[PDB]
Amino acid sequence: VGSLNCIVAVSQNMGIGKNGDLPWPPLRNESRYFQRMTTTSSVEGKQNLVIMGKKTWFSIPEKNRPLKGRINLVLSRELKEPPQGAHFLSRSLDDALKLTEQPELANKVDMVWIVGGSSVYKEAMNHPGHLKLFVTRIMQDFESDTFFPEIDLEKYKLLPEYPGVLSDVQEEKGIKYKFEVYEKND
Ligand SMILES: NC(=O)C1=CN([C@@H]2O[C@H](COP(=O)(O)OP(=O)(O)OC[C@H]3O[C@@H](n4cnc5c(N)ncnc54)[C@H](OP(=O)(O)O)[C@@H]3O)[C@@H](O)[C@H]2O)C=CC1
Ligand SMILES: CN(Cc1coc2nc(N)nc(N)c12)c1ccc(C(=O)N[C@@H](CCC(=O)O)C(=O)O)cc1
């Protein structure tokens, strides 16, 4: 309906997950920022849609499932029905976007947030149209078993600044990271 965005935390070796979880120790402020970006809606009486693969759903601690104040959609071709706590189930990303245009959700949804995993990001990244990437750069190498797709800099531009995103290097548990905003339109 509105804006389509991807949001991801990545290590310096482009790693995003190791055994069902994050490769680095928990960053409470990095988690808070994911929460704030995905939950805030720009319009009244409207909520954001969160779209994720099934192994991403199963890595959110059970006590936080479904993500509060968000419409939670799970992607999977194997599942018969949405997992317990999930609001919707889709077989592909074109179908999940064909769904926000149903009067059911059409008047309800402001932004669309892709929250992973690899397979999901890869396809959003090739979708034609306006898209923004929200990338947290975790500045060290971490042994990973799942990786973020290559960002094609001939198509995506790094923005010099973005409203409500801090520009400086953060530090938490001795780890440095920074926030980037990339924009495409083709
Ligand atoms: N650092 C960060 O930002 C992030 C880290 N993570 C972490 O990364 C890993 C999650 O990994 P990843 O394996 O890539 O998993 P996904 O969450 O992408 O799960 C893959 C499953 O999702 C379904 N699916 C994925 N893409 C599609 C599609 N286009 N259409 C329909 N179904 C699809 C399929 O389920 P089926 O097999 O049922 O058809 C596929 O087997 C974890 O280790 C997690 O903690 C996750 C997201 C962000
Ligand atoms: C593995 N993922 C993907 C994930 C984690 O960190 C990220 N950080 C970024 N920048 N992008 C993402 N996609 C992720 C997640 C795992 C658990 C929760 C979760 O518990 N979220 C609570 C967090 C609340 C909190 O930390 O208090 C929420 O309300 O959003 C979210 C995402």
Swiss-Prot record:
GO cellular component: cytosol; mitochondrion
Residues annotated as binding substrate: 30-35, 64, 70
CDD domains according to UniProt: DHFR
Annotated GO MF terms: dihydrofolate reductase activity; folic acid binding; mRNA binding; mRNA regulatory element binding translation repressor activity; NADP binding; NADPH binding; sequence-specific mRNA binding
Domain DHFR, first and last residues per copy: 3-184
Keyword Transferase appears in the UniProt entry: no
Outcome after substituting residue 64 to F: Increases affinity for dihydrofolate about 3-fold. No effect on affinity for NADPH
Associated pathway: Cofactor biosynthesis; tetrahydrofolate biosynthesis; 5,6,7,8-tetrahydrofolate from 7,8-dihydrofolate: step 1/1
Keywords: Cytoplasm, Disease variant, Methotrexate resistance, Mitochondrion, NADP, One-carbon metabolism, Oxidoreductase, RNA-binding
Quaternary structure note: Homodimer.
Disease with which this protein is associated in UniProt: Megaloblastic anemia due to dihydrofolate reductase deficiency: An inborn error of metabolism, characterized by megaloblastic anemia and/or pancytopenia, severe cerebral folate deficiency, and cerebral tetrahydrobiopterin deficiency. Clinical features include variable neurologic symptoms, ranging from severe developmental delay and generalized seizures in infancy, to childhood absence epilepsy with learning difficulties, to lack of symptoms.
Name used for this protein in its record: Dihydrofolate reductase
